[PDB]
Write an enzyme that holds these catalytic residues in place. Sequence first.
Site, mmCIF file in Angstrom:
data_model
loop_
_atom_site.group_PDB
_atom_site.id
_atom_site.type_symbol
_atom_site.label_atom_id
_atom_site.label_comp_id
_atom_site.label_asym_id
_atom_site.label_seq_id
_atom_site.Cartn_x
_atom_site.Cartn_y
_atom_site.Cartn_z
ATOM 1 N N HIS A 144 -35.621 -72.110 7.566
ATOM 2 C CA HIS A 144 -35.969 -71.257 6.440
ATOM 3 C C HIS A 144 -37.479 -71.154 6.283
ATOM 4 C CE1 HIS A 144 -36.950 -74.629 3.746
ATOM 5 N NE2 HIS A 144 -35.898 -75.236 4.261
ATOM 6 N N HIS A 170 -36.508 -66.613 -6.547
ATOM 7 C CA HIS A 170 -37.022 -65.913 -5.381
ATOM 8 C C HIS A 170 -37.626 -64.654 -5.914
ATOM 9 C CE1 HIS A 170 -33.771 -68.154 -2.863
ATOM 10 N NE2 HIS A 170 -34.834 -68.904 -3.081
ATOM 11 N N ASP A 199 -11.282 -62.105 -20.592
ATOM 12 C CA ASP A 199 -12.150 -61.632 -21.691
ATOM 13 C C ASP A 199 -13.389 -62.518 -21.954
ATOM 14 O OD1 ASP A 199 -10.019 -63.400 -22.542
ATOM 15 O OD2 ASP A 199 -10.755 -63.106 -24.610
ATOM 16 N N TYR A 211 -33.660 -80.696 8.892
ATOM 17 C CA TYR A 211 -32.218 -80.833 8.759
ATOM 18 C C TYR A 211 -31.652 -81.055 10.153
ATOM 19 C CZ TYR A 211 -34.057 -78.157 4.795
ATOM 20 O OH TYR A 211 -34.844 -77.676 3.778
ATOM 21 N N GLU A 236 -42.142 -75.737 0.430
ATOM 22 C CA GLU A 236 -40.906 -76.479 0.641
ATOM 23 C C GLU A 236 -40.519 -76.666 2.114
ATOM 24 O OE1 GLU A 236 -37.397 -74.448 -0.975
ATOM 25 O OE2 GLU A 236 -38.750 -72.722 -1.296
ATOM 26 N N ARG A 258 -35.737 -82.238 2.266
ATOM 27 C CA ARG A 258 -36.659 -81.206 1.816
ATOM 28 C C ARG A 258 -37.464 -81.755 0.644
ATOM 29 N NH1 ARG A 258 -33.357 -77.417 1.250
ATOM 30 N NH2 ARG A 258 -32.961 -77.228 -0.997
ATOM 31 N N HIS A 275 -27.404 -74.321 1.146
ATOM 32 C CA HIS A 275 -26.912 -73.916 -0.169
ATOM 33 C C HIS A 275 -25.632 -74.664 -0.520
ATOM 34 C CE1 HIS A 275 -29.454 -70.176 0.723
ATOM 35 N NE2 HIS A 275 -30.079 -70.853 -0.226
ATOM 36 N N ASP A 322 -32.164 -80.146 -5.188
ATOM 37 C CA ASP A 322 -32.940 -78.950 -5.484
ATOM 38 C C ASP A 322 -32.466 -78.400 -6.826
ATOM 39 O OD1 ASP A 322 -34.534 -76.686 -5.452
ATOM 40 O OD2 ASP A 322 -34.056 -76.154 -3.407
ATOM 41 N N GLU A 357 -40.123 -80.083 -2.188
ATOM 42 C CA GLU A 357 -40.596 -78.812 -2.686
ATOM 43 C C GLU A 357 -41.384 -78.921 -3.998
ATOM 44 O OE1 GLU A 357 -37.421 -76.115 -3.810
ATOM 45 O OE2 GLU A 357 -38.952 -74.503 -3.901
ATOM 46 N N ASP A 400 -38.671 -74.799 -9.826
ATOM 47 C CA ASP A 400 -37.981 -74.908 -8.551
ATOM 48 C C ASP A 400 -38.491 -76.125 -7.755
ATOM 49 O OD1 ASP A 400 -36.712 -74.523 -6.164
ATOM 50 O OD2 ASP A 400 -37.604 -72.546 -5.820
ATOM 51 N N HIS A 447 -41.752 -69.126 -0.983
ATOM 52 C CA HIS A 447 -41.403 -67.858 -1.593
ATOM 53 C C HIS A 447 -42.121 -67.730 -2.930
ATOM 54 C CE1 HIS A 447 -38.819 -69.790 -4.566
ATOM 55 N NE2 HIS A 447 -38.339 -70.525 -3.581
HETATM 56 MG MG LIG Z 1 -35.693 -75.089 -4.509
HETATM 57 ZN ZN LIG Z 2 -37.694 -72.711 -3.615
#
Ligand SMILES: [Mg+2]
Ligand SMILES: [Zn+2]
Lengths: 440, 439, 440, 439
Positions: free
Chosen positions: D350, D361, D38, D387, D383, D404, D243, D260, D406, D271, D354
Amino acid sequence: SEISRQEFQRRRQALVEQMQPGSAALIFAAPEVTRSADSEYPYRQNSDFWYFTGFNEPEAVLVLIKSDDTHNHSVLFNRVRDLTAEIWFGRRLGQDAAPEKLGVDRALAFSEINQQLYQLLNGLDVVYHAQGEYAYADVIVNSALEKLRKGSRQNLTAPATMIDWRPVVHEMRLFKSPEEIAVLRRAGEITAMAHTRAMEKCRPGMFEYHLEGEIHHEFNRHGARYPSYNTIVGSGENGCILHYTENECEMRDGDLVLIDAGCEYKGYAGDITRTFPVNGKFTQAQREIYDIVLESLETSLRLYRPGTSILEVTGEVVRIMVSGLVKLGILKGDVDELIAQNAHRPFFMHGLSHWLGLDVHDVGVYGQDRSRILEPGMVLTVEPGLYIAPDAEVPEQYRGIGIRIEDDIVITETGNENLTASVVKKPEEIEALMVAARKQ
Amino acid sequence: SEISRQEFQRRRQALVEQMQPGSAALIFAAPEVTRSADSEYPYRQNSDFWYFTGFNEPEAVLVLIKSDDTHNHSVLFNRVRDLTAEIWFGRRLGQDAAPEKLGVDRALAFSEINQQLYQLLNGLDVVYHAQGEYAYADVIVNSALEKLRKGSRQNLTAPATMIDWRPVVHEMRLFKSPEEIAVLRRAGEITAMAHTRAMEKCRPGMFEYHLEGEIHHEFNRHGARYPSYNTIVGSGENGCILHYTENECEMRDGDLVLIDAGCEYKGYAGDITRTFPVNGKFTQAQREIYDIVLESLETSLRLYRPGTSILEVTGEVVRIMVSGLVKLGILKGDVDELIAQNAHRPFFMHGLSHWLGLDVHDVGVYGQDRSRILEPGMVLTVEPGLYIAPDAEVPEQYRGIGIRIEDDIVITETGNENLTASVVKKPEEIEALMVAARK
Amino acid sequence: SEISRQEFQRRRQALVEQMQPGSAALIFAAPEVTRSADSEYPYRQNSDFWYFTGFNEPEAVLVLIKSDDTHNHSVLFNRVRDLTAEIWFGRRLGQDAAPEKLGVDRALAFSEINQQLYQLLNGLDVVYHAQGEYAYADVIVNSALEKLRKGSRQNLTAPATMIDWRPVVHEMRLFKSPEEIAVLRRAGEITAMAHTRAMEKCRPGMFEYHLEGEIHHEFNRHGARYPSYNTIVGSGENGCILHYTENECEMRDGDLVLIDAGCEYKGYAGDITRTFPVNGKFTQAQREIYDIVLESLETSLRLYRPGTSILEVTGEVVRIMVSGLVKLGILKGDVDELIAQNAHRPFFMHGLSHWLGLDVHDVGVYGQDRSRILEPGMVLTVEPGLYIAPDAEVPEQYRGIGIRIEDDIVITETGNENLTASVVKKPEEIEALMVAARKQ
Amino acid sequence: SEISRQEFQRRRQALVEQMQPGSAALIFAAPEVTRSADSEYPYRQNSDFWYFTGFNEPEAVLVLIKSDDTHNHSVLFNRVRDLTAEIWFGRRLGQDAAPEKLGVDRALAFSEINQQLYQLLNGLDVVYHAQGEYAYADVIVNSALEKLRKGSRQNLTAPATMIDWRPVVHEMRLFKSPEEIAVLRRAGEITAMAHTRAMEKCRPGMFEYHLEGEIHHEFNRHGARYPSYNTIVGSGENGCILHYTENECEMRDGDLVLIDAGCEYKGYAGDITRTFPVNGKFTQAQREIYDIVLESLETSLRLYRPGTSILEVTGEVVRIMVSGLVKLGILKGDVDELIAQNAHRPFFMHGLSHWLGLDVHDVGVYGQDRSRILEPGMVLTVEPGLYIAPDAEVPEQYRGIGIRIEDDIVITETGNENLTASVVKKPEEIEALMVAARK
Ligand SMILES: [Mg+2]
Ligand SMILES: [Zn+2]
Ligand SMILES: [Cl-]
Ligand SMILES: [Cl-]
Ligand SMILES: [Cl-]
Ligand SMILES: [Cl-]
Ligand SMILES: [Mg+2]
Ligand SMILES: [Mg+2]
Ligand SMILES: [Mg+2]
Ligand SMILES: [Mg+2]
Ligand SMILES: [Mg+2]
Ligand SMILES: [Zn+2]
Ligand SMILES: [Zn+2]
Ligand SMILES: [Zn+2]
């Protein structure tokens, strides 16, 4: 003949006897079915709902409640009486007349089912429900159970156990009562009369559908308004197509016509096939194939009795077919080796027998390869056939021949009773029947 | 009579002419329909799919693609040819024969529709789809559009505009071509022959369903295998029940029998009602009600023409009905006041006319209260009736009487043509027909 | 603390012990959940699936199969190892490591479930399934059963009996093991530390959400990343709104703030409420209401033990509340008559106690009006409150006051153990805590 | 910064301006979302519904009706005021306050939507609806249209044309107004402060989730209560998992940590990614890979401007990456040939950029391979990353490195503005920041 009020009552009680105490069985009517736009096909009741009620309306639900081993009762949900709606869409039984008419303890309006069903199921341990049969029924049952599960603050509880009643009910339907056998006896007779008529009316130059017309007219005049399945009238090469229902060709002099047709009488199916010459005269080649199929049928009719099976009788038919086909040069080789490699199958690709009842291909467990041992009260078809494709690599004269001969039988204490023998199948009797009619 | 290959082609092009450039129209076949367990009812094609194809298989989809004002083409999805599956479940057209047979540029297997449809819709601006008509069709179309929306990395785009083609197509169907009128003429004739036969065969002591049997046999022998709707044979008090299809009673000397029955011939519906005495002779009371209904029909047949409407002609029929019922003492009061309060309604509760074609209650916009102006090519029924309930507070001799007389007409440049007048309706002619048959 | 491999195994076996022979239990993982467009909320495993596995992936199904009273085994469906898909969407257990990691006999790819599940259910008499829990799970189960029902020619049979396992499993979850109690003990401690911090950090001029921020930071630093429910910080008149989660107002000098917050630690919920003055000093009016709620809590804590019920303890709290409110002139009349007419309900409209565990409002049968007799191992909250609306017709000084004080307890052999007493609740101890923090 | 009442009004009118006359647009709120049993997750409004309303309740529908080119009006369906239900489940705007609060002409109870929506759509030509977005919305819309189609006797008609408004609305969202840029500027600043804080707090022996904790506390104290996406804190070999959100490992001296994280402020997403050494000092090997990624970012920041594209700028970054990797012996061969065979892909899999806005995104057409020409008002991320897998066949010192960096930018008339440059990225500045915090 018909099914008595007392029989419908016996059936309901036989189901209740098999139910656990603190349970309810839910049996839903068939929905109405669109033909095109706002027009509907003639209503056909669900066979299981019919079996327990003999009631021919949609939007109805039979609820059998078993409190314990002595106490049980019935509730029917059905459409209310409405002056306007009936003036239009025909008379309805309604709630006042239903208890006496259908022998139920209580009748409620179908419009109230969602407000009432959960109250009937509240506190029970088991609900019997044919899940997946109809989407509208599953919605109703699932809503009731959801209300109960979520209603603990209102002191509601859902039965945690759901059991499919279909196996139990279909096992009941597999064994016919004397009343059911008398109805099927009448269905077989009506159907036989229709096939006899078709043979007598047949002339070259008619279309296949003309014989369908004769057959349906005959069903109707005995009070069997609808066929139990779509009528097949396959003449010439159409006879090799098992589910040919187009019936759109002109019947030619020199061709056979294969007619598979059965009436539905009080819900029960007749199912007869006869094959005969359009011109009233079997050719040698047609006769040679016909005799193999006939011997198969006649032998099967001798053999069927308690203690054998469809599998066992089929093995005898295969031998007859393979032997016959070897003698005609349609098959080549050793009979036993040909049998071992199922060499008949290009020519006979379907089962010899299916159960018969409220559905033409009736419910009930067959056993693996239809090996179940036969017992009195079972009703089944016997339908050997041979179908030689127009392009089959066999002596040219046999090509494009499709022959099936099918009777309906009931297994008895000592053998079987043929319910459809009143329409002829011996080739000379077919010819004589046609000759006499042509005088007319 | 039949619908030609060229006609089906004309119809497709008439739809394409109304479509936007960069669009596709999707027209789905009807699903097969269960009767009981594994047995199915005789297949009935979707009327709209039939209209563009004359193709009587399920699991088929007609796709009309309009690239621009000059370029268009057609793709059919249909069931593949399968040796085994056809030996069993009947012959299938298949992909090889379909282009030539159905006049389509391209034919694909229905099993491949989810792998192919999105590719056909990719990059188009508009898709025409009858959303909600069939659940299986909506699933297919929604899946295609989803693939397209989510397929930007694969350079796919969905048409953002979806248009229901039913209004356009139904407006087409509302106006019959000469070929369609010839087919409906034949359906009217077949149906009239069946009704004539029923009157000639009728005897007291037969059941209502026996006349249904005669009627269906007649449809069948002219090649119309199925009725266009479930046959009504309502004798006596069953006559007052509008959708009485049980047809289960013994027909009794002294009663009327109301027969509403129509064939389906090449997809098109006949739709005739005749009411007549089971014993071949109208009583005075029966005749008194019958005459009101017949005058209503005959007057309507004179009036229907371009420029009037169903609403307008209905107003005349109501006046005839109210006047007649007042003369008989069934209604009491001033005719105009009774008309103003719709006092006829208890006795005549349905419409005078509906459109007729591939469906018995055919598609097409009626206008408010069926006020649309009639034009040449429209086909409709004319079916006044009077139904007096067994317990109606009226003189006894009128209770439990149900009478309807129904003809099918086509509107012409100057009037109408009656397609079903070859079965008699004047009471003296009905009696004479029955007397002659009983000799 | 945590749950051991052996505990997850014991739980599975306790369920199997209650299952019929020739049966299978199907326990499905929670689906992933969209937050906006292509982004998803942090994954939260289904509590029942978690209970038997401690496995935190979607697209997994635990299947427990009981052949008979001695023989049983387990099959896990879970996502396959995929190099690319994991580089992106994080590591997956896969099929090779799963048996050893999760103690299952067999692991299969979730992509194969429709090809495999029906084979596992073939020939069984009973399937245990929580129907209606998840739509994706119902689709899978219904497809398997449909394949079996319709597969008689392939010698397949469907279990005719379907039983909801939720009542059995939820009854198991209602009684905590020692391992579970140790985890809840830690959850209570972490949650208490967060509430203490909030009291210490609180200053007038901060927003309600600042205290939420302090609380969540405290949860996180002990390794409890997510709250067990959405945090409530209701200051002033927001305190009278039971599920106030906007936490958007500036906290004013002279107001109380009601904080209801709990961490989720190893799946288990803490659930604490504390109410205190934003300025570190209860007013007389605030103190007068606070004392009634505190006495209610303290008395309930003395009373809770085996043999009583939530209903019974609630009756004592109602008496305390009604007596207190009459003394303040908030209610007027005879105490017993006021109690008889539930005159407290405008001011205390919710339950005193709910079960606590893997869900904050935990599973388990309460009995009618929460009358079930308490036994050792049950875990519950104790949360009296009084909420006086801004427009209530009572002495003006009490209007717009919302006070709740909530602890979590476990029922023991002789009484209860308070899992959340390490955060203060006596008004003078709250004031002293705040004074000390403001020095600092 | 905030979005004004007038802005929401402008947006609604900008949609209405693009709608056909005789049409209605239907914009549905997000459903509430179960977390367990619930309990529900914190409510997150649908971005499109939010864009036109700023209204944070479920069970609401915005209906914009365009009668013609001059006349239009708005109807809101939302939850009624209920004394009991709000005492429990929080305050509701209700019908009385909604017109003034949300600037709508009319407000109706959501409980009445099935009784009212069809009446609003009756007689219109076009309905704009995001079909497939929510199942509950499709049910409502399909029911309304069904009632209309089947309601001809009641003089009802359904619009035959349904248009997906998402392409139009998403094209609007792709170009930010000044108010939106100011809100995104604030989100970038809040997010940058959180990343700065993480770098300053980081010590070996803390767990990855402790930095997540610091970051979320920082978001919260500036009034951004929720992240715009699940926070990534990948230290050591976790850095190579794109991710990675488990954030469950102890951070070790000698490793890098990739963070990130972005806030959601007034619906708009920050971001930011920063990578830095857990012990405050880059090794030579770490620095060698870091410099390639930083050069890629810095060059991209110089290049992005109106007239170029993400595709075009990406091509420059690939050259930088391939050249750098060849210098280090991570790649071997001719730079142009390596570029031609996309030899960088194993290390940078990647996209470079974006769109950014109400979704991290964000919506908007990219063009094939993200080749759409950039224009002022577009907001996007930059970004680049490298890797190197733990088992990559490269020199040992580069294995298990994930880096990375960004930033978020807005395209201006002549270039871009960097919204996230207030958190450091030059390796010397990162080191100095950490040293200062550790004093
Ligand atoms: Mg990011
Ligand atoms: Zn991003
Ligand atoms: Cl009803
Ligand atoms: Cl196919
Ligand atoms: Cl998988
Ligand atoms: Cl509402
Ligand atoms: Mg047969
Ligand atoms: Mg008619
Ligand atoms: Mg009479
Ligand atoms: Mg709480
Ligand atoms: Mg290393
Ligand atoms: Zn048969
Ligand atoms: Zn008609
Ligand atoms: Zn609580």
